[PDB]
Design a protein around this motif. Structure first.
Motif, PDB file in Angstrom:
ATOM      1  N   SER A  70     -90.299  61.000 -44.264  1.00  0.00           N
ATOM      2  CA  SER A  70     -89.170  60.142 -44.518  1.00  0.00           C
ATOM      3  C   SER A  70     -88.923  59.356 -43.261  1.00  0.00           C
ATOM      4  O   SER A  70     -89.317  59.771 -42.190  1.00  0.00           O
ATOM      5  CB  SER A  70     -87.933  61.005 -44.840  1.00  0.00           C
ATOM      6  OG  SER A  70     -87.353  61.504 -43.628  1.00  0.00           O
ATOM      7  N   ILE A  71     -88.267  58.219 -43.395  1.00  0.00           N
ATOM      8  CA  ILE A  71     -87.773  57.461 -42.232  1.00  0.00           C
ATOM      9  C   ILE A  71     -86.371  56.961 -42.527  1.00  0.00           C
ATOM     10  O   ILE A  71     -85.914  57.055 -43.668  1.00  0.00           O
ATOM     11  CB  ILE A  71     -88.652  56.236 -41.891  1.00  0.00           C
ATOM     12  CG1 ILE A  71     -88.879  55.388 -43.139  1.00  0.00           C
ATOM     13  CG2 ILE A  71     -89.952  56.676 -41.263  1.00  0.00           C
ATOM     14  CD1 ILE A  71     -87.751  54.457 -43.412  1.00  0.00           C
ATOM     15  N   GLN A  72     -85.688  56.438 -41.513  1.00  0.00           N
ATOM     16  CA  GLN A  72     -84.459  55.672 -41.764  1.00  0.00           C
ATOM     17  C   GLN A  72     -84.814  54.198 -41.665  1.00  0.00           C
ATOM     18  O   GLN A  72     -85.393  53.752 -40.687  1.00  0.00           O
ATOM     19  CB  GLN A  72     -83.321  56.032 -40.802  1.00  0.00           C
ATOM     20  CG  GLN A  72     -82.581  57.316 -41.172  1.00  0.00           C
ATOM     21  CD  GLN A  72     -81.548  57.158 -42.273  1.00  0.00           C
ATOM     22  OE1 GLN A  72     -80.973  56.089 -42.463  1.00  0.00           O
ATOM     23  NE2 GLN A  72     -81.279  58.250 -42.988  1.00  0.00           N
ATOM     24  N   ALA A  73     -84.481  53.454 -42.706  1.00  0.00           N
ATOM     25  CA  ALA A  73     -84.820  52.063 -42.782  1.00  0.00           C
ATOM     26  C   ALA A  73     -83.565  51.249 -42.612  1.00  0.00           C
ATOM     27  O   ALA A  73     -82.541  51.542 -43.215  1.00  0.00           O
ATOM     28  CB  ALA A  73     -85.466  51.758 -44.142  1.00  0.00           C
ATOM     29  N   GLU A  74     -83.668  50.216 -41.790  1.00  0.00           N
ATOM     30  CA  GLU A  74     -82.635  49.210 -41.673  1.00  0.00           C
ATOM     31  C   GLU A  74     -83.105  47.918 -42.320  1.00  0.00           C
ATOM     32  O   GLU A  74     -84.090  47.308 -41.881  1.00  0.00           O
ATOM     33  CB  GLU A  74     -82.334  48.972 -40.211  1.00  0.00           C
ATOM     34  CG  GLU A  74     -82.054  50.262 -39.481  1.00  0.00           C
ATOM     35  CD  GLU A  74     -80.727  50.908 -39.901  1.00  0.00           C
ATOM     36  OE1 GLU A  74     -79.781  50.147 -40.238  1.00  0.00           O
ATOM     37  OE2 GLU A  74     -80.641  52.170 -39.880  1.00  0.00           O
ATOM     38  N   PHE A  75     -82.401  47.501 -43.362  1.00  0.00           N
ATOM     39  CA  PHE A  75     -82.759  46.300 -44.085  1.00  0.00           C
ATOM     40  C   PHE A  75     -81.905  45.111 -43.656  1.00  0.00           C
ATOM     41  O   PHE A  75     -80.744  45.264 -43.280  1.00  0.00           O
ATOM     42  CB  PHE A  75     -82.581  46.511 -45.588  1.00  0.00           C
ATOM     43  CG  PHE A  75     -83.443  47.603 -46.169  1.00  0.00           C
ATOM     44  CD1 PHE A  75     -82.908  48.849 -46.443  1.00  0.00           C
ATOM     45  CD2 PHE A  75     -84.787  47.375 -46.455  1.00  0.00           C
ATOM     46  CE1 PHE A  75     -83.695  49.858 -46.993  1.00  0.00           C
ATOM     47  CE2 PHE A  75     -85.588  48.385 -46.997  1.00  0.00           C
ATOM     48  CZ  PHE A  75     -85.038  49.627 -47.267  1.00  0.00           C
ATOM     49  N   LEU A  76     -82.500  43.926 -43.702  1.00  0.00           N
ATOM     50  CA  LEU A  76     -81.740  42.701 -43.777  1.00  0.00           C
ATOM     51  C   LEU A  76     -82.082  42.135 -45.129  1.00  0.00           C
ATOM     52  O   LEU A  76     -83.147  42.420 -45.650  1.00  0.00           O
ATOM     53  CB  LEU A  76     -82.076  41.727 -42.648  1.00  0.00           C
ATOM     54  CG  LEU A  76     -83.499  41.655 -42.097  1.00  0.00           C
ATOM     55  CD1 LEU A  76     -83.633  40.416 -41.190  1.00  0.00           C
ATOM     56  CD2 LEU A  76     -83.878  42.911 -41.327  1.00  0.00           C
ATOM     57  N   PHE A  77     -81.179  41.352 -45.703  1.00  0.00           N
ATOM     58  CA  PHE A  77     -81.346  40.873 -47.050  1.00  0.00           C
ATOM     59  C   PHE A  77     -80.198  39.989 -47.429  1.00  0.00           C
ATOM     60  O   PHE A  77     -79.146  40.023 -46.812  1.00  0.00           O
ATOM     61  CB  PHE A  77     -81.405  42.042 -48.046  1.00  0.00           C
ATOM     62  CG  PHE A  77     -80.196  42.909 -48.017  1.00  0.00           C
ATOM     63  CD1 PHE A  77     -80.122  43.973 -47.154  1.00  0.00           C
ATOM     64  CD2 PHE A  77     -79.115  42.633 -48.829  1.00  0.00           C
ATOM     65  CE1 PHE A  77     -78.996  44.752 -47.104  1.00  0.00           C
ATOM     66  CE2 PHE A  77     -77.988  43.417 -48.788  1.00  0.00           C
ATOM     67  CZ  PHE A  77     -77.922  44.476 -47.925  1.00  0.00           C
ATOM     68  N   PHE A 106     -76.721  43.534 -43.823  1.00  0.00           N
ATOM     69  CA  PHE A 106     -77.509  44.616 -43.277  1.00  0.00           C
ATOM     70  C   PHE A 106     -77.137  45.874 -44.015  1.00  0.00           C
ATOM     71  O   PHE A 106     -76.240  45.845 -44.869  1.00  0.00           O
ATOM     72  CB  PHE A 106     -77.279  44.737 -41.781  1.00  0.00           C
ATOM     73  CG  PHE A 106     -77.695  43.511 -41.029  1.00  0.00           C
ATOM     74  CD1 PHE A 106     -78.924  43.459 -40.381  1.00  0.00           C
ATOM     75  CD2 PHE A 106     -76.877  42.383 -41.010  1.00  0.00           C
ATOM     76  CE1 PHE A 106     -79.316  42.317 -39.699  1.00  0.00           C
ATOM     77  CE2 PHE A 106     -77.263  41.239 -40.332  1.00  0.00           C
ATOM     78  CZ  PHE A 106     -78.485  41.206 -39.673  1.00  0.00           C
ATOM     79  N   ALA A 107     -77.966  46.893 -43.840  1.00  0.00           N
ATOM     80  CA  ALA A 107     -77.821  48.150 -44.545  1.00  0.00           C
ATOM     81  C   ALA A 107     -78.667  49.198 -43.846  1.00  0.00           C
ATOM     82  O   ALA A 107     -79.533  48.870 -43.036  1.00  0.00           O
ATOM     83  CB  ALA A 107     -78.249  47.999 -45.995  1.00  0.00           C
ATOM     84  N   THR A 108     -78.422  50.457 -44.172  1.00  0.00           N
ATOM     85  CA  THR A 108     -79.270  51.535 -43.707  1.00  0.00           C
ATOM     86  C   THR A 108     -79.531  52.435 -44.907  1.00  0.00           C
ATOM     87  O   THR A 108     -78.595  52.779 -45.624  1.00  0.00           O
ATOM     88  CB  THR A 108     -78.563  52.347 -42.621  1.00  0.00           C
ATOM     89  OG1 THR A 108     -79.524  53.052 -41.814  1.00  0.00           O
ATOM     90  CG2 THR A 108     -77.600  53.332 -43.262  1.00  0.00           C
ATOM     91  N   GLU A 109     -80.799  52.762 -45.158  1.00  0.00           N
ATOM     92  CA  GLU A 109     -81.156  53.744 -46.193  1.00  0.00           C
ATOM     93  C   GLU A 109     -82.313  54.638 -45.752  1.00  0.00           C
ATOM     94  O   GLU A 109     -83.090  54.296 -44.869  1.00  0.00           O
ATOM     95  CB  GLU A 109     -81.535  53.079 -47.527  1.00  0.00           C
ATOM     96  CG  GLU A 109     -80.420  52.332 -48.255  1.00  0.00           C
ATOM     97  CD  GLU A 109     -79.234  53.224 -48.627  1.00  0.00           C
ATOM     98  OE1 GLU A 109     -79.090  54.325 -48.035  1.00  0.00           O
ATOM     99  OE2 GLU A 109     -78.436  52.821 -49.508  1.00  0.00           O
ATOM    100  N   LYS A 110     -82.396  55.794 -46.392  1.00  0.00           N
ATOM    101  CA  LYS A 110     -83.495  56.718 -46.193  1.00  0.00           C
ATOM    102  C   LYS A 110     -84.600  56.347 -47.166  1.00  0.00           C
ATOM    103  O   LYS A 110     -84.332  56.010 -48.332  1.00  0.00           O
ATOM    104  CB  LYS A 110     -83.035  58.154 -46.464  1.00  0.00           C
ATOM    105  CG  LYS A 110     -83.998  59.212 -45.981  1.00  0.00           C
ATOM    106  CD  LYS A 110     -83.379  60.602 -46.049  1.00  0.00           C
ATOM    107  CE  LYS A 110     -84.151  61.567 -45.189  1.00  0.00           C
ATOM    108  NZ  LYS A 110     -83.278  62.638 -44.610  1.00  0.00           N
ATOM    109  N   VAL A 111     -85.841  56.391 -46.692  1.00  0.00           N
ATOM    110  CA  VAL A 111     -86.971  56.203 -47.585  1.00  0.00           C
ATOM    111  C   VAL A 111     -87.959  57.336 -47.386  1.00  0.00           C
ATOM    112  O   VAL A 111     -88.276  57.707 -46.265  1.00  0.00           O
ATOM    113  CB  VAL A 111     -87.672  54.821 -47.376  1.00  0.00           C
ATOM    114  CG1 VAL A 111     -88.621  54.532 -48.540  1.00  0.00           C
ATOM    115  CG2 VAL A 111     -86.628  53.730 -47.252  1.00  0.00           C
ATOM    116  N   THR A 112     -88.450  57.875 -48.486  1.00  0.00           N
ATOM    117  CA  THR A 112     -89.366  59.013 -48.430  1.00  0.00           C
ATOM    118  C   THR A 112     -90.627  58.706 -49.200  1.00  0.00           C
ATOM    119  O   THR A 112     -90.555  58.259 -50.319  1.00  0.00           O
ATOM    120  CB  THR A 112     -88.718  60.236 -49.070  1.00  0.00           C
ATOM    121  OG1 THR A 112     -87.471  60.489 -48.419  1.00  0.00           O
ATOM    122  CG2 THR A 112     -89.619  61.448 -48.948  1.00  0.00           C
ATOM    123  N   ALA A 113     -91.775  58.936 -48.592  1.00  0.00           N
ATOM    124  CA  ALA A 113     -93.075  58.875 -49.309  1.00  0.00           C
ATOM    125  C   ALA A 113     -93.212  60.011 -50.331  1.00  0.00           C
ATOM    126  O   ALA A 113     -93.235  61.180 -49.951  1.00  0.00           O
ATOM    127  CB  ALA A 113     -94.215  58.938 -48.303  1.00  0.00           C
TER     128      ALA A 113
END
Length: 172
Positions: free
Chosen positions: A63-70, A80-87
């Motif tokens: 897993s990582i912590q992802a910071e998005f722009l959008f 901006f946002a922050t979410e967890k993403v897991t393979a």
């Protein structure tokens, strides 16, 4: 199985490595240059200018912590946002080939890598719960699209209309 012809681990798995793809995002910014759909629960309605950068590598969880722009219709400027993403594993794969996005309050949404190389991905968005089915394209340089990913993206997105997502205009 109700899956795309490209979900074929014996044939394609060496180019469908999600964990390696999540970690690439730690060393380089990724941008979504094109997509074939316009409404997503994660990006928003009428989304544009999506990109990501990653941290908090957790090998045990993959897993990582992802910071998005959008950009979407919820606001006029960059968000901006922050979410967890897991393979995770989808379509009967032995080896992680999918992106599980998790919101702070436990909402989960899973997209599948169709194809990937060191500087790009083509990502499939199944669109269940009545959501929009489509394809995404990501690269480490919004000005330069790697041809293998583009080729795979146009092939797998056949019959769908394409549109720009993150272009230079996003950062004026």
């Amino acid at each position: 199985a109700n899956q795309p012809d490209w979900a074929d681990e014996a044939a394609n798995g060496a180019h469908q490595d999600a964990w390696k793809s999540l970690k690439a995002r730690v060393e380089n910014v990724y941008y979504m240059v094109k997509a074939t759909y316009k409404n997503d629960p994660v990006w928003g309605n009428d989304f544009t200018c999506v990109g990501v950068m990653a941290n908090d590598v957790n090998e045990d969880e993959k897993s990582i912590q992802a910071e998005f722009l959008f950009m979407n219709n919820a606001d006029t400027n960059m968000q901006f946002a922050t979410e967890k993403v897991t393979a995770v594993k989808m379509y009967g794969y032995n080896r992680e080939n999918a992106f599980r996005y998790e919101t702070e309050d436990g909402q989960v949404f899973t997209d599948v890598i169709a194809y990937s190389d060191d500087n790009c991905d083509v990502i499939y968005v199944p669109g269940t719960d009545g959501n929009e089915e489509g394809y995404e394209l990501w690269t480490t340089d919004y000005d330069n699209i790697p041809a293998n990913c583009l080729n795979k993206f146009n092939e797998y997105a056949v019959g769908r209309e394409t549109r720009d997502v993150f272009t230079s205009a996003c950062l004026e």
